[PDB]
Design a protein around this ligand. Structure first.
Ligand SMILES: [K+]
Ligand SMILES: [K+]
Ligand SMILES: [Mg+2]
Ligand SMILES: [Mg+2]
Ligand SMILES: [Mg+2]
Ligand SMILES: [Mg+2]
Ligand SMILES: [Mg+2]
Ligand SMILES: [Mg+2]
Ligand SMILES: [Mg+2]
Ligand SMILES: [Mg+2]
Ligand SMILES: [Mg+2]
Ligand SMILES: [Mg+2]
Ligand SMILES: [Mg+2]
Ligand SMILES: [Mg+2]
Ligand SMILES: [Mg+2]
Ligand SMILES: [Mg+2]
Ligand SMILES: [Mg+2]
Ligand SMILES: [Mg+2]
Ligand SMILES: [Mg+2]
Ligand SMILES: [Mg+2]
Ligand SMILES: [Mg+2]
Lengths: 185, 260
RNA sequence: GGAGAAUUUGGACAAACUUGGUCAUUUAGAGGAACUAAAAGUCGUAACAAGGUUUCCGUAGGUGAACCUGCGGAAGGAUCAU
RNA sequence: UAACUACUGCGAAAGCAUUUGCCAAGGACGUUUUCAUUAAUCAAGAACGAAAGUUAGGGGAUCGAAGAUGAUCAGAUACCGUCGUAGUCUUAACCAUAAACUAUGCCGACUAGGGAUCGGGUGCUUGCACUCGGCACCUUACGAGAAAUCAAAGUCUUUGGGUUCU
RNA sequence: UAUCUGGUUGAUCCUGCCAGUAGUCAUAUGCUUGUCUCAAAGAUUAAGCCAUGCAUGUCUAAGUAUAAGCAAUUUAUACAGUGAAACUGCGAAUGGCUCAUUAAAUCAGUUAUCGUUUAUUUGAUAGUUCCUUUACUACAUGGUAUAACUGUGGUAAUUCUAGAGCUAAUACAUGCUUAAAAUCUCGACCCUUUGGAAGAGAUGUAUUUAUUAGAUAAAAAAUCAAUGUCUUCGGACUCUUUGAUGAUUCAUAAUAACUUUUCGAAUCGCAUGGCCUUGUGCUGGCGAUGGUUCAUUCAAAUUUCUGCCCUAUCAACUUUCGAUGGUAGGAUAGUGGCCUACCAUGGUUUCAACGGGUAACGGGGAAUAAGGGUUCGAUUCCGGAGAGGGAGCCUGAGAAACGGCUACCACAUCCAAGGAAGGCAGCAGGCGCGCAAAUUACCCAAUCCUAAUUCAGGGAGGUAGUGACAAUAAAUAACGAUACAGGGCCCAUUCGGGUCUUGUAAUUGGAAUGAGUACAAUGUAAAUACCUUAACGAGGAACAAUUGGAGGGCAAGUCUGGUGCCAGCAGCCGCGGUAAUUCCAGCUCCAAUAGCGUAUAUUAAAGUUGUUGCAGUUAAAAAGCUCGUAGUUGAACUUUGGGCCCGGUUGGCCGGUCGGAUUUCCAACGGGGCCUUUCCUUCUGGCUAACCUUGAGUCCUUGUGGCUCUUGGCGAACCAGGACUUUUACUUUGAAAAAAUUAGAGUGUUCAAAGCAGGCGUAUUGCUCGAAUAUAUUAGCAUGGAAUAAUAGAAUAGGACGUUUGGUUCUAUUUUGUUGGUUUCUAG
RNA sequence: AACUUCGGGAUAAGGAUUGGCUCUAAGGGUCGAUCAACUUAGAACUGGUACGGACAAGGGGAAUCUGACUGUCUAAUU
C-alpha cells in the first residue's frame, strides 16, 4: 500500500514493419549520427509526436487565448532553449514543420564530434561512455543527453581522466611498468 | 466500518498540506479538536514540513514535550493537534509568533506576526442562541463557546477574541463594504470587499466579492469570513494580500526575480 | 437481611434436520436418427445448352436414389413483337 | 364465360370479364360549401389472404394426383398413349402460405424532354388543345450505380425531410 | 495519433468474409540474457484445506506496592528510589486481507435530520445535596470484599482451576459539605379594614407528564371585571419584556406534581508561601485525573434526486402468513409496515415491471485512441461486504466482532477414551487446484497508529531475498599507419603521380574502458546494492548476442548438399511425386535486438454494428396486404423596423528607440440604457445616495477632453416586507464534481522513466523562488438569454381593470391604566 | 404433476385444523316499533395436546399387456 510510482513508454514502433523506403531512411540516420538501434530513432519520433500534438491542439484555439499564449510560449522557449528550434522561428506554426534530424543534431554524441574532440560520431559514443567528456563541471556518460545551448561552450574533457589531465590511464600504467622493469636490473 | 477510523493514508490526505508521495504511506491524522479534519493543519506538518525545524515525527514530539509551542496561548503535547485558520502558534524559544492564514493558492502560509498581534484572533460566529438558565452564547468557527455577547452580534459576524481571557473585545457586523477572507472553494485564500448577498431561502446564500484589481467573484456564504472594513484589516495579511494573478502575470513577476 | 447459583413458565429471534414443491446449472445412457470431414468407391443422370420432359415457387400424392406427377403461381425463359 | 380482350379498367392485396335487378361501398374530378391540425409511420394487437390441403353435408359434366394400363428403354411402377380415385364446383367451418414479384416499404418535397391512352373538367368552331388524377411507354442522362440498368435505383464522403421492417 | 495488403476468376469490376499488420500497468509459455534506476507478484481454478512460529497490548512527577524483588547512601517509624506480579483505567470496533455474496442493492455525484446517537478532543458550564433545618449525621475524611502473595490440592491433557488464610483503590457500595436574596403557597394573631402580618414550607440539575409564555399590519377612542394606579385626585392613567429560522409545539423560561431519584470531586503529584489567634489556626500556587449539561470535533445511522451489464425461448408482478395506504399502540438512538391491532384496496409495469443469467463487488480509473466509439477495472485511493457455512449474543461510546463467546451444520486436532481444544480471505510457509504467481529472513531507523504514554508495542509499515510482470537509461568496441580494390578531380604520354580519400586483408601498432574481483570510505537500524575509489582487470581462439525469417502478402538468395506427394513445411495463398527460390541442413543475407518468438483474450485496422456512418431490384436482407395502440415525428402565424445616446475591445493613425505607451479621430466588432400606440413584477419604509434642488457662479486644456453645497427633492443606486407570481426543454457564466491517475507550467534526477524538489550568499552562524494551471457532461444548485421546440390562457364569458356604489365575511394593531369583558371608527 | 379426445386426470400427490365453555359479528319478516329461523366467520377461556373421541368412513404412486367407454352371459366350479 505505497503510492504507485508512475512510468511511461518513451517510444513508438512504426505501423507497417517492412516498408523499404523507411528502413533505408532510418539506416541513413543510424549511420550519420551513430545510433545503436532503431529504438533510438523511434524515441525521437515519439518526442516529436507529443510536441506536434501539443501545437496542433493550441492552433485550434484562437489567438489571444490564455492557454494558447501561456503554453505556446512555454513550448517555444523549451525548444529554443535546447537549440532545436532556431531564434528566427518562434511562431508555433514553425514548431510543427520540424524534422527528426533537428533533434538528433543537438544530442551529446554529435555535439562532441561537431566541436572537434573526437573526429567521429562512433568515437564520440566511446568517449562519452568511457567517462572522458564532461559538461561544465561534471561527467555525463549519456549520449542521449540533449545539450541546452547555454552549455555548448562549457563542454570539454573532464578534470578527472586522461586527455583533460590527471593520471595517464590503466593501459599506459601497465605499459610504462613493463618497459621500466625491462630496462633496469 | 464498526467504529471510527484512526489512520489516514498519504493519498487521502488534504492536498494543501503538500506531503510528498514516496516518503511514507500514512499521513498524520488530525486528532479531534477545534477545526474540521480537512480544514486543519497538524502541528507535525507545521513544524516538520513547513518550518523545517523537525526532521522526523520523533523530533516533533521532542519539541512538543519540552512545552515550548502553544496554540492560542496554551501548551499542546499532541503531534496531530488540529490547528486551523486564524490560530496563533507561539514558540517561546526564537520568540516567533505565527498566525495560520491562507495564501492565494489555498494553503497555509508561514506568516510571522509581532507579539502584540498574537494577543488576539478573529472568530466567525456560527450560531448564537440561548443556553441554560437563559444565558445567551455565541459559537465561533474554532468552536469556542462565549457567553454574554453583545445583542448586536448576529450569525456570520466576526468577533475579536482576547485569548488570555477569551472574551469579546470587539466585533464586525456582516454587511456590504466589509473586507473578507474566503476560507474554502476555488477562491480559497482570496481577499476582497463584499458587494451584495443573494438570499435563496431553504438553500445557500451567495456573496459577490470585488477585490482591489476589480475582479468580481461569487462564493457561498459558508466560505466567507469578515476581517475588517474597506482597506482596514484587523489582522496583518500575508504577502500578496489575496489578489490572485494569472499564470501569465505570475510568470512575468518571476522574470523580475530572474534578473539576479 | 439485601444480594444471589442450579433450575424453571411463556415469548420473540431462530440455526439445523426430515419432508414434499419449484427454479437454475452440470452430467451418465443400450439404442436411434442426423450432420460434417468429403473430393475420390457403388448405382444411376436430376441440374447447367430447348441439358435432351424449359427451369423454379407454394402445396399434395408417389418412392432404391437422385427425382416423378397433379393444381395454382413466377420468369430469374427458349417470347419485350400482329 | 370464348371471339370482342389491349403495354386497357377496377381493387388494400389475394383477385375481378354473359344479362338485368336490389344492397351498401369507393376513387378521381368539380366546388368563392364545412371543421380547423383532427396528421405521417407504426412494437403490441387485429381484418382480409391464389392454389393445394382438412372436417361435415350437397354436387359430381370435364380434366385428373394416387392407381390401373399399352408402348418406349439395359431399367422406366418417367416423359408419350387409354382409363381413373381424391381432387376440380358449392354450403358451414378450418388452414395462413406462394417466384403472395415491380424479387423495389410507406408519407412528403424537388430535379427533363416527348408523344400516346383511361377517367373527370374547362375552352371551343366539336376534334383538337389545356387541365387535375390514373395505368403505362419512348429519348437522354443531368445525376446514380459493381454493372446489368434506373425519371427513380436521382437530389448520399459536398455524407441529416419523417418513419416501420429486415 | 485520419494509411491498408494477400486469398473466389482464363481475365475483370463488385459483395463479402478468411489471412496478414500494430498496440495491450494482458495473462501464460518457449528460447535467450552483461550493466544502472524502478518494481508487479496464489486475483482468475478451490471465499478449497491448513503443521509450525509470529501478527495487540499498554506506566507517567501525577489511580493501587510490605514482591519474604533489586537497591540502597542516608530526603523520613506511615509511604517516599527503581520496580516483576495482579487490580483499576484505556485499547483491542483501527489496521491488514479478500472479492464470495450483491443488478435500484452496492456505488457516484447531490441533498436532508424541524428525524437521531456520539468514547474521545476542544470551548463553556455546578454556593441551592443534610431533611425536623434543636437528636447525632464522621467531613481532621465513612463501609467490606477481593486480587496478586503464602500455604494445601486435583487433572492423562489446555492461557483448567478448587479449598483455606492475608491485604489496597480514581475498583465496589455509602455519605456530610458553604453567601445572601427574591418569589410563591400555607398560615399564627386582630378586624370586618379598598385590611397585613409574624414564621412554616418549597424553589439547583437530571427524570416523566400536563399546562403557560415564547408578541409585533399602521392610527382613534367608546364600554369597564372595575377595585389596581399615583394621591395634582376630576381616579393624571404613562412607561411595559420578548432571541433564532425559509418554516416549528424551536431555543429558553415559568407553573403543578412525578422518579427500584441521575449528577453536584471521601481522588493524585510537584511547589511550599502568606497571615499569627505559633494551635498543627486560618488562608493559598502550578496541574493530574474525574464529572452534569450544552456546544464542538472525530464519527454513525437513516435519507432526496438522477444514473447500472445480457435476457421477452421471462408479460404480467405484489396482496394467505405486510403487499400500498390510514388511525392507535409497541419497539428503536430516532423516522418509517420496523412490528401488532383495526380499517381501506391499494402499489409496480411495453418509458420493460416481475423473473432468469452474469466466468458482476461499485467508483476513482486502465487499454486502444482523427473525430465519434469499443473493451477492461479481483488489484496501491475512496465506498461496501466477509472472515469454513448459518443464526444468536455478551462487553462496550462504538461490534450483530470472529487473532470475542454460544449453538447447530461441515471439516479437522490431542487423549491415559473420562474428556479437552479448534477457524491464515493478516505475515511467512505447506498441501491441493491448476496455463497461471516469492523467504517459515532482518528491523521499528523512516511512515504513522495505539496506550496510563518523549521511553513500551506494532509481520500496520519499512529493509533485504526470490523476481526478463511492466517501464527508464544503456557495453559487447575506438583511433592510427603501411595495406589493398578502387572510385573524386587535377599529370591525360598508352607510362597512370597515389593524386582527395573510401572500402576489404585469418597484416601489425600504442592507447580507452567498466563487466567482474577488491583496500577503504560512503550508504544503512545493522548490512546489501548504487554513487565515489586505491590496487587488480579486452587482443578477437577470447569478456565470443540472441530470437525469428529469406516464394508472395513482407525486408532479405531460381546459392550448394540431402529427401523424392515421403518426411516435413505452410496464420492465408500455397510448397514437396529426382535441377525443391518454400521441407532437413551448410553458406550467405534480412529484421528487430538484451531481447525475440508462440498461444489465448482484447483494441485499432472495421463505414465488417454504421449517432457521426453501412446495406436491403439482381450479391444477405422490404413484412402477402391493409387497419392500429404505445413509440418516433408533425404546415404557417403573435415587437418588426426606425431614430438616439453612453461607456467598452482590438487594429489604429504618428509605435516615433523595429519593444511598449496615449489624445481625439478613422473604423470594425461586441455590450448597456432611452424614445418611437412599447412589464422595465407590484407596492410599503430604510436613505434619499445622487445631481436641472443653488446660502458664496465663473474653481476651470479646444464651451460636448466641466465645481466649492443649501431646502422638499427624482429613490431602479439599494435592502426586507406583505402581495401573487403559466409550465418546461435548450444554451451562457459561475459554483461544484477528494487525492492519485490524464493533459500541463517550473525545475539539468549526470540523461531519462521519475521526483517535488530546488536556487543564490561574505558557505564563518542566511537569504530566497516553488510545490501552478486545465479538463471531467448525464443529475442537482445559482445566474444571464428568450431564437428553436413544446405548454397555459377570455367563447353557454363563472373573463379583465376599478378611486366606484352597497351588502356580507372575518381578522387586531398604538390606544381607551392594566389583564379582561366589549360595540364601533378603522386598517388590511 | 405427467398426460389429454381440452371434457378430464383430481379426493391426483401432499399438508394443516376439528372438544367444551363464555362471548362477538354478519346475514331476515310485518306494520321507527314489533316478531322470528337457523347458517357462516371470528375471539377469549379451558383440559394428562384431548377432540369426525363410540358409530360411521378412499390407501397411494411409477409403468406394461389388454378391452375404447356404460352395458351383457356359462342359475349350481370360468
Ligand atoms: K522482398
Ligand atoms: K363395463
Ligand atoms: Mg476495517
Ligand atoms: Mg439431365
Ligand atoms: Mg431438364
Ligand atoms: Mg406485427
Ligand atoms: Mg414467405
Ligand atoms: Mg406511529
Ligand atoms: Mg463473483
Ligand atoms: Mg475494483
Ligand atoms: Mg472472481
Ligand atoms: Mg478458508
Ligand atoms: Mg463484520
Ligand atoms: Mg460472527
Ligand atoms: Mg485469523
Ligand atoms: Mg480482526
Ligand atoms: Mg456490409
Ligand atoms: Mg393418475
Ligand atoms: Mg390429498
Ligand atoms: Mg370392457
Ligand atoms: Mg357358473
Amino acid at each position: 500500500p505505497r503510492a504507485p510510482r508512475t512510468y511511461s513508454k518513451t517510444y513508438s514502433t512504426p505501423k507497417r514493419p517492412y516498408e523499404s523506403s523507411r528502413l533505408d531512411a532510418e539506416l541513413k540516420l543510424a549511420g550519420e549520427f551513430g545510433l545503436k538501434n532503431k529504438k533510438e530513432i523511434y524515441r525521437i519520433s515519439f518526442q516529436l509526436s507529443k510536441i506536434r500534438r501539443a501545437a496542433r491542439d493550441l492552433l485550434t484555439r484562437d489567438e489571444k487565448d490564455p492557454k494558447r499564449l501561456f503554453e505556446g510560449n512555454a513550448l517555444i522557449r523549451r525548444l529554443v532553449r535546447v537549440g532545436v528550434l532556431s531564434e528566427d522561428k518562434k511562431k508555433l506554426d514553425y514548431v510543427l514543420a520540424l524534422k527528426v534530424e533537428d533533434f538528433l543534431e543537438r544530442r551529446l554524441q554529435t555535439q562532441v564530434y561537431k566541436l572537434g574532440l573526437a573526429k567521429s560520431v562512433h568515437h564520440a559514443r566511446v568517449l562519452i561512455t568511457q567517462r572522458h567528456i564532461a559538461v561544465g563541471k561534471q561527467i555525463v556518460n549519456i549520449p542521449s543527453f540533449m545539450v541546452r545551448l547555454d552549455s555548448e561552450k562549457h563542454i570539454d574533457f573532464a578534470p578527472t581522466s586522461p586527455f583533460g589531465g590527471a593520471r595517464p590511464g590503466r593501459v599506459a600504467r601497465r605499459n610504462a611498468a613493463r618497459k621500466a622493469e625491462a630496462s633496469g636490473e | 466500518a464498526r467504529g471510527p477510523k484512526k489512520h489516514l493514508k498519504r493519498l487521502a490526505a488534504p492536498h494543501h498540506w503538500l506531503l510528498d508521495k514516496l516518503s511514507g504511506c500514512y499521513a498524520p491524522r488530525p486528532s479531534a479538536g477545534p477545526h474540521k479534519l480537512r480544514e486543519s493543519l497538524p502541528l507535525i506538518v507545521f513544524l516538520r514540513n513547513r518550518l523545517k525545524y523537525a526532521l522526523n515525527g520523533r523530533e516533533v514530539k521532542a519539541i512538543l514535550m519540552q512545552r515550548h509551542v502553544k496554540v492560542d496561548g496554551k501548551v499542546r503535547t499532541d503531534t496531530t493537534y488540529p490547528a486551523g485558520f486564524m490560530d496563533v502558534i507561539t514558540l517561546d524559544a526564537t520568540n516567533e509568533n505565527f498566525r495560520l492564514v491562507y495564501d492565494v493558492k489555498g494553503r497555509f502560509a508561514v506568516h510571522r506576526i509581532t507579539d502584540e498581534e498574537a494577543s488576539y484572533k478573529l472568530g466567525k460566529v456560527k450560531k448564537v442562541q440561548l443556553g441554560k438558565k437563559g444565558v445567551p452564547y455565541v459559537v465561533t468557527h474554532d468552536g469556542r463557546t462565549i457567553r454574554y455577547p453583545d445583542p448586536n452580534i448576529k450569525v456570520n459576524d466576526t468577533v475579536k477574541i482576547d485569548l488570555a481571557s477569551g472574551k469579546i473585545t470587539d466585533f464586525i457586523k456582516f454587511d456590504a463594504g466589509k473586507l473578507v477572507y474566503v476560507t474554502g472553494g476555488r477562491n480559497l485564500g482570496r481577499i476582497g470587499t463584499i458587494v451584495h448577498k443573494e438570499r435563496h431561502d431553504g438553500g445557500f446564500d451567495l456573496v459577490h466579492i470585488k477585490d482591489s484589481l476589480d475582479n468580481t467573484f461569487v462564493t457561498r456564504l459558508n466560505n466567507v469570513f469578515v476581517i475588517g472594513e474597506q482597506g482596514k484589516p484587523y489582522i496583518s495579511l500575508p504577502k500578496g494580500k489575496g489578489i490572485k494573478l494569472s499564470i501569465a502575470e505570475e510568470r512575468d513577476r518571476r522574470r523580475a526575480q530572474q534578473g539576479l
